[PDB]
């Protein structure tokens, strides 16, 4: 069973290779997660230099297996049940009146460490828009991730809207469409409709000189009974 692997503190590694409008970049992330409290503590560093997109735009891409599923909802946790073999997470992030990100992530265990290997492809962005023009505030609003089952591919589907805060007080919408399918041929939990209550706090490490992001997140499942 996959949930038994999440009863304690599990180390996390995140590696991303990106390409947004021709601007190639790499990000290396480290940290730890505690699923019993749905707590995530992560630090990301841009290894290729300076990040060509704002850090808040990449938070969703940067391990829902650390979500806290209440006891009565434990039969609906797809994420943990796909482990140790894992799942392939694919997203189409559509920024309103701007471009889009197309992601492909492999989330699985490498020893006692949970790894997220991601490949991001961003296209059709405006050079003067909120993303490439770096007009977004360094924060993150609370939101809900709506999950639905996909029996045909033996995984799940997810739909949600992210509201990024612009420097002028406005809102940059980022619609998310998500598909997760298991890597292993092992049994997975196909869920009923529910949601993940997400909360994220973004900060900086005062001693770090490289382009980075420190993230603190809390994710809890709800919407049933």
Curated annotation (Swiss-Prot):
Changing residue 166 to V: In EBFP1.2; shifts the excitation and emission spectra to shorter wavelengths and increases quantum yields compared to BFP. Photocytes. Changing residue 162 to T: In P11; increases fluorescence at 475 nm excitation and at warmer temperatures such as 37 degrees Celsius. In Esmerald; leads to brighter fluorescence. In VisGreen; leads to brighter fluorescence. It comes from the Eukaryota. Changing residue 219 to R: In Azurite; shifts the excitation and emission spectra to shorter wavelengths and increases quantum yields compared to BFP. Changing residue 98 to E: In mut1.27; shifts fluorescence lifetime from 3.03 to 2.85 ns. Changing residue 140 to H: In mut1.3; shifts fluorescence lifetime from 3.03 to 2.78 ns. In mut1.5; shifts fluorescence lifetime from 3.03 to 2.72 ns. In mut1.27; shifts fluorescence lifetime from 3.03 to 2.85 ns. Changing residue 141 to I: In ECFP; leads to cyan fluorescence, folds faster and more efficiently at 37 degrees Celsius and has superior solubility and brightness. Changing residue 140 to C: In mut1.9; shifts fluorescence lifetime from 3.03 to 2.74 ns. Changing residue 198 to I: Suppresses the 475 nm excitation peak, leaving only the shorter wavelength peak at 399 nm. In H9; increases fluorescence at 395 nm excitation. Monomer. Belongs to the GFP family. This is Green fluorescent protein. It comes from Aequorea victoria.
